[PDB]
């Protein structure tokens, strides 16, 4: 048919005109095809005859369809859609199976969809192509467009915005019957009984004829399972689509990447999915069909990940009247696994969280971004935050808000002692430590060279200045702190002016990419009291000065 | 009546931002209100040969539980600068920044005047729906909406028809509007004031346009200078740090002299030693602090350049700020205090978007001290504003030392 429903209007760019793309010579073969073709489209009603007064033309192929059976009509717009108008989007977002309210779901299925539906008359004229004749001879048969071209730019647009407003009066009449439309498809459920829920999909079937749009029969597919998007939906349950670990010799780099992609996919209903181990496997440039062999970490992370899948894992679907649960659980070093739920352990969706954000970030800050992720992400799902259940203390998490430079919030949450529990790993000193040696490092370095000579000197006349070799003027400051640490005692007083190397160990960093950052670590975690003060960097004051003298002098 | 022809900055294109998530109840609540605008014919659905958007909110109003639909036309306000201050502009005048003000909101005015047939597109707006299942509502503009800094413009003639007989009785009381609310100020007692408000008020409401409070008293809007410690004690520790702050307070506030409390007590001691003190440091703490009390000599305002709010979390519930121009050249420095660290620092932006907005009259732009995804996530839960300042999110450094 072609619905009857109002027409979306169109144009194109403003500072444009339709293409004028010349139809390249087809074989014989080829012309028979698109005039067997066409003509049954004409008796359709999908397109119409036209003469050479028509200044627009789009070229026209034609490629033998599944097996080569029957030939295919393939109508390269690419000219015709850069100069159409742009849309709005057909979709900013997919339902997640996770959202979708728990009886009876079947798929009604849209047959010639984009063919069914009218299209602007002023703007059909654009979408004029032309069939050649035995080696450009005779003219050619010209047509155009009166219903949606297939690959047109706005085709999906104009689909969609229809079968919306074709289904709002049915929908207004049963709104206990779900209905997502996703492309050609129709995914439509409801808590009646497989009887009165055919009669209801038959009503819809109907409403949908009385607007040109046909549908398929006893053919509907319905009978969940439900093969969509990668999962595989159940009225009752959800989950991904089965993954299957192929297990074999050697793995080469594009092997590893369909794995990490699996196991990515995977991980949204199977908790402790892990990845951190393959996916190292898979840095530096290198070739696709590289083969890499496994180190024992991998070779041992592939084994619990194929334990994990070895039994059917589902998620359940979303009830409104209840809450949602998360508890975030700290795995590995840097690597954040969670669950979210309503019913203690039958898990609605879980995941995991793994981003770095920088060099330089203790566990509580991770924490504080892992719980920022899965709220956002509750809200495009669920529509509203989920309570969390964190492995932190009260304790540590009110002490570290409480002081950070930066504003941080956090929903309402409680505590669950499972470990590991997360943690500051020290502290540092407010007041200074008296009776306590006050090292006063510093640094520098030629810019033109790169050599630098790092250093200290105490109020007990101590006074150390290894030389280094290739380290920035800031290494160099940041060098003359992790000294200060080793040859100091389980107190000290260090005073830099190294604004930079303040900023750093400032904010409680317990790992880095920093190798010295690490090992001033260490050394923090070890000592037992440790105080933090800066001064003009090279302004000439009582200690720096001094410093500074045996530090620049030479090597500067 | 007649729509006032509307155009865009030639070589720009209208908005295409997206949606923001929003949660059921700000879902709910605004397929209510745009419900009704639709009775009402204020904005109209739209299909989607619409490739523009701007993106919407719903607010809470004067801490009531009626919502309030708030579009964020930051973005087209951009695209229309031309339009709404050049063309139409709206002065600014200085006499309001002198006893009491009052913010009325004059909003509701706007869905009376239509808007330029041809302009209407770029004021589509899409009302999402919960984990996409649906779609996803599509509407637009027919009369001048809220956000929009185009609608004061248009709407500042008709203002002035209304005010008229108000200002020709009462020549002393400054008015000033300023995209969606209607600023009064006046020198006399607040039950003076108080009542002249109500007096204008019933003008308003002879023009269909009816009113709330919340009364500013910028006459009493004092700078936050730079404190210089005073304890009757001193460590080495102390007077380092005062020689570190010292040394800021010159890269600005041009005169601080350091150089007598420097070179002072030096050498090499521990940083506890307790220390003497000078004739020259008396004098220096003294003589530079009374420096740092006063305004920076050599800033002044600039009308063509943006102004930058810049905050620092300084610790229990104490938030510092500075408003300049050209960094560390404050215009005005200043505190906020008095639950959630979010919850605090919006209150905070939006008192100094409305102080910045009754001295210079235009909203600065924040340099704010938090994660961009938690900021997002959450400051509609909090605002109350109509406006939507300009912002950018940054990573305080080591300086909240000192107060500014
Ligand atoms: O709300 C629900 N519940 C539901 C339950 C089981 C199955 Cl299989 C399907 C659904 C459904 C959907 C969908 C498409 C994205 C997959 C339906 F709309 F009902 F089809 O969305």
């Not at chain 2, 200002?167 to 509007?177: A, L, R």
Request: net charge neutral; with cysteine; charged share 25%.
């Amino acid at each position: 048919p072609i619905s009857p429903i109002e027409t979306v209007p169109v144009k194109l760019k403003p500072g444009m005109d339709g293409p004028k793309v010349k139809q390249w010579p087809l074989t014989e073969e080829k012309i028979k095809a698109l005039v067997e073709i066409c003509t049954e489209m004409e008796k359709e009603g999908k397109i119409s005859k036209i003469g050479p007064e028509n200044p627009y033309n789009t070229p026209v192929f034609a490629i033998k369809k599944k097996d080569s059976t029957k030939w295919r009509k393939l109508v390269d717009f690419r000219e015709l859609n850069k100069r159409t108008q742009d849309f709005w989007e057909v979709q900013l977002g997919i339902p997640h199976p996770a959202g979708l309210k728990k009886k009876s779901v079947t798929v009604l299925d849209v047959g010639d969809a984009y063919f069914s539906v009218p299209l602007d008359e002023d703007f059909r004229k654009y979408t004029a192509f032309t069939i050649p004749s035995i080696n450009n001879e005779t003219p050619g048969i010209r047509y155009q467009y009166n219903v949606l071209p297939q690959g047109w730019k706005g085709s999906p647009a104009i689909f969609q915005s229809s079968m919306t407003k074709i289904l709002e009066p049915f929908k207004k009449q049963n709104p206990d019957i779900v209905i997502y439309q996703y492309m050609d498809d129709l995914y439509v459920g409801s808590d009646l009984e497989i009887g009165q829920h055919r009669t209801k999909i038959e009503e819809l079937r109907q409403h949908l004829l009385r607007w040109g749009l046909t549908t398929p029969d006893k053919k509907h597919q319905k009978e969940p399972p439900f093969l969509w998007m990668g999962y595989e939906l159940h009225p009752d349950k959800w989950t991904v689509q089965p993954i299957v670990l192929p297990e074999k010799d050697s793995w080469t780099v594009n092997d590893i990447q369909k794995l990490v992609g699996k196991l990515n996919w995977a991980s949204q209903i199977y908790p402790g999915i892990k990845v951190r181990q393959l996916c190292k496997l898979l840095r530096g440039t290198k070739a696709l069909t590289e083969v890499i062999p496994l180190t024992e970490e991998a070779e041992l992370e592939l084994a619990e990940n194929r334990e994990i899948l070895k039994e059917p894992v589902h998620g359940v679907y979303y009830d409104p009247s209840k809450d949602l649960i998360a508890e975030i659980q700290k795995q590995g070093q840097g690597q954040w696994t969670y669950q979210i739920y309503q019913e203690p352990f039958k898990n609605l969706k879980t995941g995991k969280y793994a981003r770095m954000r920088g060099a330089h970030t203790n566990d509580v800050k991770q924490l504080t971004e892992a719980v920022q992720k899965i709220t956002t992400e509750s809200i495009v799902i669920w529509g509203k935050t989920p309570k969390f259940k964190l492995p932190i203390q009260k304790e540590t998490w009110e002490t570290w808000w409480t002081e950070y430079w930066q504003a941080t919030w956090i929903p309402e949450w409680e505590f669950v002692n499972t470990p590991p529990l997360v943690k500051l790993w020290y502290q540092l000193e407010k007041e200074p430590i008296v009776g306590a040696e006050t090292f006063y490092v510093d640094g520098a370095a030629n810019r033109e060279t790169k050599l630098g000579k790092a250093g200290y000197v105490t109020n007990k006349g101590r006074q150390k200045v290894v030389p280094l070799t290739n380290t920035t003027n800031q290494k160099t400051q940041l060098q003359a702190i992790y000294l200060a640490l080793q040859d100091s005692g389980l107190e000290v007083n260090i005073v830099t002016d190294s604004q930079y190397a303040l900023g750093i160990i400032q904010a409680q960093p317990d790992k880095s990419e920093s190798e010295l950052v690490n090992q001033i670590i260490e050394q923090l975690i070890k000592k037992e009291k440790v105080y933090l003060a800066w001064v003009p960097a090279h302004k000439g004051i009582g200690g720096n000065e001094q410093v500074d003298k045996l530090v620049s002098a030479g090597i500067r | 009546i007649e729509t006032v022809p509307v155009k865009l900055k030639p070589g720009m294109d209208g908005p295409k931002v997206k949606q923001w998530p929003l949660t059921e109840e700000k879902i709910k609540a605004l397929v209510e209100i745009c419900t009704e605008m639709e009775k009402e014919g204020k904005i109209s659905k739209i299909g989607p040969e619409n490739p523009y958007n701007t993106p919407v909110f719903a607010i809470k109003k004067k801490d009531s539980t009626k919502w309030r639909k708030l579009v964020d036309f930051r973005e087209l306000n951009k695209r229309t600068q031309d339009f709404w201050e050049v063309q139409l502009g709206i002065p600014h005048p200085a006499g309001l920044k002198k006893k009491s003000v009052t913010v009325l909101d004059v909003g509701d005015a706007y869905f009376s005047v239509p808007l330029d047939e041809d302009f209407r597109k770029y004021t589509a707006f899409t009302i999402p729906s919960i984990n996409n299942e649906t779609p996803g509502i599509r509407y637009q503009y027919n009369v001048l909406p809220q956000g929009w800094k185009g609608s004061p413009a248009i709407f500042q003639s008709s203002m002035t028809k209304i005010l008229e007989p108000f200002k020709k009785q009462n020549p002393d009381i400054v008015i000033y509007q300023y995209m969606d609310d209607l600023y009064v100020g006046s020198d006399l007692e607040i039950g003076q004031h108080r009542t002249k408000i109500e007096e204008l008020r019933q003008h308003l409401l002879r023009w269909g346009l009816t009113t709330p409070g919340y009364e500013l008293h910028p006459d009493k809007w004092t700078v936050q200078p730079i404190v210089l410690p005073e304890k009757d004690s001193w460590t080495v520790n102390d007077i380092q740090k005062l020689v570190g702050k010292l040394n800021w307070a010159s890269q600005i506030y041009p005169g601080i002299k350091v150089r007598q409390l420097c070179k002072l007590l030096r050498g090499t001691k521990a940083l506890t030693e307790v220390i003497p003190l000078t004739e020259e440091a008396e004098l220096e703490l003294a003589e530079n602090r009374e420096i740092l009390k006063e305004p920076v000599h050599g800033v002044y305002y600039d009308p063509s350049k943006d102004l930058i709010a810049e905050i620092q979390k300084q610790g229990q519930g104490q938030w510092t700020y500075q408003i300049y121009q050209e960094p560390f050249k404050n215009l005005k420095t200043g505190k906020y205090a008095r639950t959630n660290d979010v919850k605090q620092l919006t209150e905070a932006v939006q008192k100094i978007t409305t102080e910045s907005i009754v001295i210079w009259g235009k909203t600065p732009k924040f340099k704010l001290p938090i994660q961009k995804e938690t900021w997002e996530t959450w400051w509609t839960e909090y605002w109350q504003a109509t406006w939507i300042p300009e912002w950018e999110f940054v990573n305080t450094p080591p300086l909240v030392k000192l107060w500014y």
